[PDB]
């Protein structure tokens, strides 16, 4: 049965106006800016951008990849697909 989301979990993350996007729940580095309450720091593969999202926008990767893991015209998306499949826990700093 599911647990709560934790850093390192892989997802497709939904933002208004964008397709469901390959992403991870990130750690917060010591000394770094914390997210608001009930929000997680989401690192988007490909774009390498961070946004703060709640669980309603977070779709677990294994369950969702057959639906959402297809090439997309959008900038950074297909690079993102490669990252989530091939090295989802690397440093992309």
Swiss-Prot record:
Widely expressed. High expression is found in heart, skeletal muscle, ovary and testis. Overexpression is frequently observed in hepatocellular carcinoma samples. Residues 7-64 form the PWWP domain. It comes from the Eukaryota. It is found in: Nucleus; Cytoplasm. Changing residue 21 to A: Loss of interaction with histone H3K36me2. Interacts with HDGF. Interacts with trimethylated 'Lys-36' of histone H3 (H3K36me3). Interacts with trimethylated 'Lys-79' of histone H3 (H3K79me3), but has higher affinity for H3K36me3. Interacts with IWS1. Interacts with H2AX, POGZ, RBBP8 and CBX1. Interacts with histones H3K9me3, H3K27me3 and H3K36me2. Interacts with DPF3a (isoform 2 of DPF3/BAF45C). Interacts with SMARCA4/BRG1/BAF190A, SMARCC1/BAF155 and SMARCD1/BAF60A in a DPF3a-dependent manner. Belongs to the HDGF family. Acts as an epigenetic regulator of myogenesis in cooperation with DPF3a (isoform 2 of DPF3/BAF45C). Associates with the BAF complex via its interaction with DPF3a and HDGFL2-DPF3a activate myogenic genes by increasing chromatin accessibility through recruitment of SMARCA4/BRG1/BAF190A (ATPase subunit of the BAF complex) to myogenic gene promoters. Promotes the repair of DNA double-strand breaks (DSBs) through the homologous recombination pathway by facilitating the recruitment of the DNA endonuclease RBBP8 to the DSBs. This is Hepatoma-derived growth factor-related protein 2. It comes from Homo sapiens (Human). The chain holds residues 1 to 93 of 671 of the full protein.
């Amino acid at each position: 049965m599911p647990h709560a989301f934790k850093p390192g979990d892989l997802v497709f993350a939904k933002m208004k106006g964008y397709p469901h996007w390959p992403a991870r729940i990130d750690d917060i580095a010591d000394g770094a800016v914390k997210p608001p309450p009930n929000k997680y720091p989401i690192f988007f593969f490909g774009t390498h951008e961070t946004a703060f999202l709640g669980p309603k926008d977070l779709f677990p990767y294994d369950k969702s990849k057959d639906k959402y893991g297809k090439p997309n015209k959008r900038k950074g998306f297909n690079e993102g697909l490669w990252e989530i499949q091939n090295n989802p826990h690397a440093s992309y700093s």
